[PDB]
Design a protein around this ligand. Structure first.
Ligand code: NA
Length: 93
């Protein structure tokens, strides 16, 4: 699946939610990280910065096999990375 390969992705970090928020505090708006999630063995979480000191934690669920994020179905992790980078680009001002 995608679970055993995500640990080597450039945007994957061995952080829990709080550590992710601390990491993103000094980053630009829209920056994010992918991390493990207690929602289950086939889940991951995306933590991204909405604005100064404001973060969002988003569930990624795996279910061959696709990744679901907020109703949207993705076939590869990179597609998700592309989505959040695109979101980050649009927020440039
Ligand atoms: Na897990």
């Amino acid at each position: 699946s995608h679970m055993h390969r995500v640990i080597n992705h450039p945007y994957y970090f061995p952080f829990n939610g709080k550590q992710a928020e601390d990491y993103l505090r000094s980053k630009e708006r829209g920056d994010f990280v992918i991390r493990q999630s207690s929602r289950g063995d086939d889940h991951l979480a995306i933590t991204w910065k909405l604005d100064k000191d404001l973060f969002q934690h988003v569930d990624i669920q795996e279910m061959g096999k696709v990744l679901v994020v907020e109703g949207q179905r993705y076939h590869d992790l990179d597609q998700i990375i592309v989505e959040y980078l695109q979101n980050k680009i649009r927020l440039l001002n």
